[PDB]
Paper text:
PmoD/AmoD represent a family of copper-binding proteins specific to MOB and AOB, the key players in global carbon and nitrogen cycling. Sequence analysis indicates that PmoD/AmoD comprises an N-terminal signal peptide followed by a periplasmic domain containing two strictly conserved cysteine residues and a C-terminal transmembrane helix within the inner membrane. We further show that PmoD is critical for the copper-dependent growth of Methylosinus trichosporium OB3b on methane.
Given that the crystals were obtained from the monomeric PmoDMet49242_1452 species, it is likely that the observed copper-binding site is a crystallization artifact. The PmoDMet49242_1452 structure differs from these canonical CuA domain structures in three distinct regions. First, the N-terminal histidine ligand in the Hx34Cx3Cx3Hx2M CuA motif typically derives from the loop between β3 and β4, but PmoDMet49242_1452 contains a small helix in place of this loop and lacks a histidine in the equivalent position. Second, the loop between β7 and β8 provides the other four CuA ligands, but PmoDMet49242_1452 lacks not only this sequence motif, but also any histidine, cysteine, or methionine residues in this area. Instead of the canonical CuA ligands, PmoDMet49242_1452 contains a cluster of surface-exposed cysteine, methionine, and histidine residues near its N terminus, including the universally conserved cysteine residues Cys41 and Cys65. Thus, despite the overall similarity in fold to other CuA domains, the PmoD CuA site is formed by two protein molecules and a completely different part of the protein structure in contrast to all previously characterized CuA centers which are housed within a single cupredoxin domain.
Residue numbers in the entry:
A (entry chain B): 37 to 163
B (entry chain A): 38 to 163
Write the structure that this text describes.
């Protein structure tokens, strides 16, 4: 559908759609108006990424210049965590009840099969 | 915002969409209803502020090759802003989308090499 809402790896993008079925039939991007049941759908644009491990961690935004990299520190901030896996169909959804308004960051980590890791951030807010 | 944008290579123009008569929410490439809509543009790269920028929003013909002929683009056109420099880096346009359907925003930048680059943002109404 749309091509505007995204997280980026260079030229390769992952399109994101957000909806909140308990509140509305509308679709959102980085300004999510309500607390509650939230579904985030990911559509990987580059077919080659379907064979690449992809991890998602959504954290409360600590508003620090540098994001924590330690797993214990990241865990303290974590709203939701999906371990790395290959998405062969190129698409997936996550559902979460956001009980609290605030700023959040979705951290998408790709593992190149050079074994190198790249992380991209999509920043959004709830409420 | 940080997620909603049209791309020129690695460069971005961030886009926010509102419908003030309907809701206090902000949208991106899915506009929920027909009617009064405001699209706000924020040009991230300072060098792009000195570049002529043209905007044409068309109904999406859903074909692999987009018409380039002026009559054909005009037949599909919802709104057209002639090329202009946005020195402040931001601007908004207001339009009443009367019809549900798929749309394409054609953004044309004129490099100071004088060559033109177009990017497309795709969205839908309803
Ligand atoms: Cu982008």
């Amino acid at each position: 559908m749309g091509n505007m809402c995204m997280v980026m790896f260079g030229y390769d993008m992952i399109h994101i759609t957000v909806f909140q079925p308990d509140k509305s039939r509308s679709e959102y991007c980085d300004e999510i108006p309500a607390t509650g049941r939230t579904i985030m759908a990911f559509d990987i644009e580059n077919p080659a990424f379907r064979d690449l491990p992809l991890e998602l961690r959504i954290i409360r935004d600590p508003l620090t210049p540098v994001l924590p990299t330690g797993e214990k520190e990241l865990d303290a901030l974590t709203e939701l965590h999906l371990p790395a896996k290959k998405y062969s169909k190129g698409t997936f959804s996550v559902e979460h009840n956001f009980a609290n308004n605030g700023h959040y960051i979705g951290l998408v980590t790709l593992t190149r099969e050079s074994g190198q890791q790249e992380t991209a951030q999509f920043k959004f807010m709830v409420g």
